[PDB]
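Q: Structure for this?
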Amino acid sequence: KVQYALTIPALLKSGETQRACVNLIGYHQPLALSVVLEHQRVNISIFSEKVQPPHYFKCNKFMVPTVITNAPDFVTLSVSGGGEDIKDRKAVVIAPLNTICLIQMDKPVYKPGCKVRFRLISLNTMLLPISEKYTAVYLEDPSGSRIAQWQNQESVGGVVQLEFPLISDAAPGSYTITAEGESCESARQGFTVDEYILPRFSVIVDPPNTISILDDILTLNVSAIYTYGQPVPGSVTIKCCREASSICTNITGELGPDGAFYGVVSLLPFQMGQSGFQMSLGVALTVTEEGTGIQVTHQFFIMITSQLATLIFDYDALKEFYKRGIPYLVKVILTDANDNPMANEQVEVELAGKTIGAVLTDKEGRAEYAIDTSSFVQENFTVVVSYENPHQCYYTEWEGPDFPTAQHFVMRFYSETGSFLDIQGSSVELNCGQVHNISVRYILSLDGMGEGATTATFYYLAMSRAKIVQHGQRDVHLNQSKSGLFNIGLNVTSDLAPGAELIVYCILDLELIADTISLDIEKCFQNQVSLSFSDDLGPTASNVSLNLSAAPGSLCGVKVIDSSLLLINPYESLSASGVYYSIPYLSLFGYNYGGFNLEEPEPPCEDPNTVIFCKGRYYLPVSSSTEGDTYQNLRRVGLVLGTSSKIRKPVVCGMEAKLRKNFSETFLWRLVSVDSEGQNTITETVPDTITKWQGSMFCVSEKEGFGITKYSANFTSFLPFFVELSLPYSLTREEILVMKAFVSNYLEECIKIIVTLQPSADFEVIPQDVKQDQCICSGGRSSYSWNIIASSLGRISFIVSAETTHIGASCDGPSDQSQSTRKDTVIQTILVQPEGIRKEETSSNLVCVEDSNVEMPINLTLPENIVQGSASAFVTFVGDVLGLPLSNLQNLLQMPYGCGEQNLARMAPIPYVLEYLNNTNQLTDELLQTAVQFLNEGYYRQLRYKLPSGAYDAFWSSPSDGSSWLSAYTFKTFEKAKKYIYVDGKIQQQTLLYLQTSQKLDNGCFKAEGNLFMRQCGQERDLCFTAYLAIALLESNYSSGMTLLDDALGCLEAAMSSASTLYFKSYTVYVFTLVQNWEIRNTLLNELKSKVVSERGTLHWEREDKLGQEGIPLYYPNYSPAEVEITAYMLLSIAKGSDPTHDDLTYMAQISVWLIQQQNSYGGFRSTQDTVVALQALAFYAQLLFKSNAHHNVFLRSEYGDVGQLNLSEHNRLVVQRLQLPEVSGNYSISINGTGCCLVQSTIRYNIPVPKENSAFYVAADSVSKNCLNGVAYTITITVSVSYRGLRNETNMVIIDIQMLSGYQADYPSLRQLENSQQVSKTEEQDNHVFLYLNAVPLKTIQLSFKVLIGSRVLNVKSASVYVYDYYETGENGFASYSQPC
Ligand SMILES: *[C@@H]1O[C@H](CO)[C@@H](O)[C@H](O)[C@H]1NC(C)=O
Ligand SMILES: *[C@@H]1O[C@H](CO)[C@@H](O)[C@H](O)[C@H]1NC(C)=O
Ligand SMILES: *[C@@H]1O[C@H](CO)[C@@H](O)[C@H](O)[C@H]1NC(C)=O
Ligand SMILES: *[C@@H]1O[C@H](CO)[C@@H](O)[C@H](O)[C@H]1NC(C)=O
Ligand SMILES: *[C@@H]1O[C@H](CO)[C@@H](O)[C@H](O)[C@H]1NC(C)=O
Ligand SMILES: *[C@@H]1O[C@H](CO)[C@@H](O)[C@H](O)[C@H]1NC(C)=O
Ligand SMILES: *[C@@H]1O[C@H](CO)[C@@H](O)[C@H](O)[C@H]1NC(C)=O
Ligand SMILES: *[C@@H]1O[C@H](CO)[C@@H](O)[C@H](O)[C@H]1NC(C)=O
Ligand SMILES: *[C@@H]1O[C@H](CO)[C@@H](O)[C@H](O)[C@H]1NC(C)=O
Ligand SMILES: *[C@@H]1O[C@H](CO)[C@@H](O)[C@H](O)[C@H]1NC(C)=O
Ligand SMILES: *[C@@H]1O[C@H](CO)[C@@H](O)[C@H](O)[C@H]1NC(C)=O
Ligand SMILES: *[C@@H]1O[C@H](CO)[C@@H](O)[C@H](O)[C@H]1NC(C)=O
Ligand SMILES: *[C@@H]1O[C@H](CO)[C@@H](O)[C@H](O)[C@H]1NC(C)=O
Ligand SMILES: *[C@@H]1O[C@H](CO)[C@@H](O)[C@H](O)[C@H]1NC(C)=O
Ligand SMILES: *[C@@H]1O[C@H](CO)[C@@H](O)[C@H](O)[C@H]1NC(C)=O
Ligand SMILES: *[C@@H]1O[C@H](CO)[C@@H](O)[C@H](O)[C@H]1NC(C)=O
Ligand SMILES: *[C@@H]1O[C@H](CO)[C@@H](O)[C@H](O)[C@H]1NC(C)=O
């Protein structure tokens, strides 16, 4: 006879080689086989062999033709021979496959100020590199807007390397990535960038997390640590209790040796064992400090349990089918409390309703019994196990059983002739390169394969992902009668991916009996990599050598990362399992694939009313609904058989189925290629940070594949001799500060040390007369200190030193030849600044000389009551009119930034100045690069304030329903500045749509949102906003056909009779110049020209604020910021004329000289909204006046001699000439000769001691101590009061900046508390100044309060200053003093 079997997967994978296995047996004459995978048109030739005598088990390769959409095909088998011929036809589905794109994100957690290092990898379905082209690689901020994009990223070796710096702001959240490709669909990825906050404490506690009722002691192992690993002396108090139904205890302790508290808590006061239960013991632990009153609180709940003993079923062994004659292996796992093994115990197993086993455990709660399954013909067979011991404490709560109990429900396994195969499953990860010997048990009954032959062959098959690999045959000699086991020599290799399913079957005479399991294989990646450093230990500035080897001809990307991250976010992208799980169809399940059943029709149902004469009684057929046989053993692995033998159970009708570390950057990111066998040496330089240096790589090759390293190589860099200095940021003149130098020894031998401070003449040092050579040893640190007099000015550097005379063997034993000399000197910086506040006085001038000479003097007069020693006289020359605001673009104004409008002053005038430079043939490559960098940084900073509604608002920390004016400003600036840097079009579209929806048409006028920007225009706020919206629309390159623009022009047309405001008239003039008009613009500017204020050679427009024209109630400040904006629009409008005539160039000069007069030493004029417009107008005006050569030589003289002889030319046209007068009270006179226009600026810088003598913006600051001890107080509390006493309608956004009291620091929790509370819109700290942005300050006094810690202690502390000023009008300001509470 002929018995045959095809084994093929049901779902073939297109384009990759698979295997088909054939199992012919029984025949005697030679045969001729043919297997064809009938595609649409072509015939494949899987087998075309001449088969010869019996036992033909061969499994042959074939290539699946590539197909783009899953399609069903047939497999035909022919057995043509001399005798019987067999024809068979099964069905399979050929499926398509994509290519996989992966993102390697090194440094899993990111912080602001870092560099995100991409890596795109494209792979075939088999892990091989392919060339891939990308078109839409870009990032996305948590707000959902694209930040950066790359175009046409071509892959060189299947890997694309990208970099992206992250701005110092870096809005915390989860940035995402999109990487669209010609084959991939979306290679999405995520970030976990978090705000870098470093709390001064970190408390560590590890509760048992579960306590039994019969427990009397609860032990706590709690400690606390600083940020940099220092002990925290103080008091730790812990209070724990619980509620009862419908008592508390508390203990305290002290620490200090190293930081540790063994907080034993007795449960006797607690009602453990009584009705005062709540199943949860709450615990609150608080740690404090002796000096500072700051405390850290940590609360956790400890579970209260009652089930002391637990018995469970391990669902790895203990299969769900029972076979006749094969013992059923019952394995029970016994654990107590928090999952601990048990000693010798008896678990009683009930088979059906009677205990049969009484199994003793194996000293680890791993008990096993062998239920004899012979003569079981039932269909359910529920086995139950229990922990019967009438001594344990088992008081259940949910009215459950009184002893641990588990139940397992099984099924019956069918086989026609009577024979069964079982495979002893494995519950461990099988390693690569090792032959394994999985065991198979078999019952092979009589009346089956045939008595008289004591030999049986069991065929053997494995399935890795969707393909058959490692076929085999194991033949057994039946020396005994019918039972036993044999070993399967499986050869696990890298070609078996995770999840390899094993199949063993035997074909007896008419029955094919098969059993399958689901082995787990470790991930080996068919490649080998041997990343390894050349030394585990080294100094902090050593030359690290790295020796990597892999498969020949491999492109191989390396990475070295601080492992401090892996203790925070242990989720590495591109792990050993992510790659493998990114593979389609790695474990077939059934026959339903792509909407195709692939299942042959069921056989006919046997009639259940036909009697049977079996032994002596009539019988009737019966079949279980839920059962298992060979067919359900397959159809689960996924194979397709075509055997003649029976593989399905019979069925009868009527019974159917129915962040705490300062980790540094990755210092190598190379992508090296491997030459020959592979001995590449990667050489880099280690950074200074003292951490771990775990190294990994992914190492692809076009021939074999890539192998990720398994155990990352580890490196450690440390300094044997540590010296550290702690200093405050700034100090006050003639103040006695103490220096604290920590010297530490990490050598195994005890050492001595001598430390010396280099004396200097700039600053004096108090001779402390302290000298002790402490015999410090391993794990120790000293606290040598010195007294420093701050009798100097400005920047001073402190240098410490060491000599390391040690006598290593303790102190008595001489070192001899053990060490020679260790040198470690650390530089430190200090800035001493005179007492008082800073003041400036700038008088800029423009010189227009045509072969003439100018001898203007310098009119400088230091004010009376001035601090001596703080005085400097400064002179600035620039070769171009708009030349100075080029080196100071990022710091155009000294004001603190952080609001929406404030931020649009470091990127708003840069497009205009760049356009001016490009137009007057002066742009340079590096200057353009710097301008682009500034623009891009500004875009990153400003993108943070965007609301999801599409509108832009200030104070992202305190959102309020968007701000229409700020949205218009940001939209206009982005549209103007999208020529150079990348700008998302969706963001502009969304903001424009928000402007669309912001109709709110009060009569014919638009209405603006927010109430903190046009606070000075009065009731005309709507008209002013409409005019500004029109200005933005015109100068964003929009024609007058838009609906918003047409409506705005219609609104502005009917405004001449009303709108008697000199602020609104300027806006209307500018918009009617932008919309080129001859009559309306002309008559409006003719009206405005009448109200011009004339000075000596300069013309400008005052605010014309008739309401309250006085000088005492805060109206004396002459430099009103408002008039600068109006004059700048006036200059812009007159410049944007039809043809500037000779009678109008003089007007240009007379309006520009005054405007350029109000320019500070940095470029900013008066405020952000003013300096932006002033710079734009100055750029446009200087566009119309330019000299090719512009010869200028300038020299400054005094009554004693000539200071300097500077020269200005084309080469010296964009760099600023800076000079300092040696004498601050001299008699100086400058001289400029040549032709052209130049700027000369003379400034005086000094200090004044808080001139609080007059009526102003009333500010009063005072303080209280809380922890005042022996003089200096550890914690301070500042409370300030602000009130407004001027004559204005309402006030605008105001800032109060407080200078910290010498060497103190801001209390970040207190500042954050002020931020969360709704009194200050935003709080910021930098360089010992804290800025608080108040939205408004009314006549009613506003009181604020916040705390301040102590850093480096200092005595003889002088006063500090609190300064309040309106951000948009610095004329109304107030000063207040601040003193130490003690
Ligand atoms: C090729 O396949 C066809 C079915 O399309 C079938 O006749 C047979 O398997 C092959 N015939 C020839 C002539 O190769
Ligand atoms: C498959 O069988 C054919 C029969 O002639 C044989 O020549 C071939 O080497 C076998 N293997 C492959 C991969 O074709
Ligand atoms: C713990 O706090 C409670 C507060 O009710 C107090 O009564 C008790 O005295 C405290 N424990 C100690 C040891 O002081
Ligand atoms: C913490 O570690 C173990 C675990 O509780 C304990 O034996 C040890 O005594 C504890 N150490 C301290 C300092 O409490
Ligand atoms: C099997 O049949 C018995 C008969 O009463 C029934 O109690 C049980 O719930 C069924 N199922 C299992 C898994 O034992
Ligand atoms: C598995 O067991 C068989 C028993 O004879 C032995 O021959 C073989 O070497 C074993 N394989 C191992 C231990 O890897
Ligand atoms: C297992 O497979 C590997 C890879 O082909 C081979 O090198 C090794 O010799 C095999 N082991 C045995 C025992 O055949
Ligand atoms: C590389 O190492 C060598 C000696 O090991 C030496 O040149 C130096 O330490 C390293 N190179 C640089 C540039 O630091
Ligand atoms: C953290 O980063 C580096 C150390 O590698 C250092 O330059 C920087 O100042 C550190 N910042 C803080 C706050 O410690
Ligand atoms: C390196 O560190 C890893 C961290 O888990 C560790 O498993 C490994 O044993 C260490 N050593 C080497 C040589 O990888
Ligand atoms: C500038 O100084 C030179 C002398 O160095 C003098 O001859 C000349 O007339 C002055 N003026 C101009 C416009 O060159
Ligand atoms: C400028 O000159 C005037 C004389 O008109 C004098 O009063 C004043 O002190 C000088 N300095 C300043 C800064 O105004
Ligand atoms: C400068 O202006 C010219 C004039 O069209 C333009 O082609 C060029 O791109 C501009 N350069 C820059 C850097 O914008
Ligand atoms: C925008 O500028 C382009 C010049 O690049 C100009 O052709 C166009 O008319 C302007 N306006 C609009 C609405 O495109
Ligand atoms: C012009 O400036 C250059 C710059 O080095 C230098 O020759 C000198 O200062 C000037 N030469 C003159 C004034 O002849
Ligand atoms: C400073 O120069 C001016 C020039 O007129 C004049 O007052 C006098 O020569 C000098 N004054 C002094 C030195 O006080
Ligand atoms: C300032 O504006 C307010 C707006 O409510 C109004 O009282 C008046 O027009 C002005 N004067 C005073 C004193 O408020």
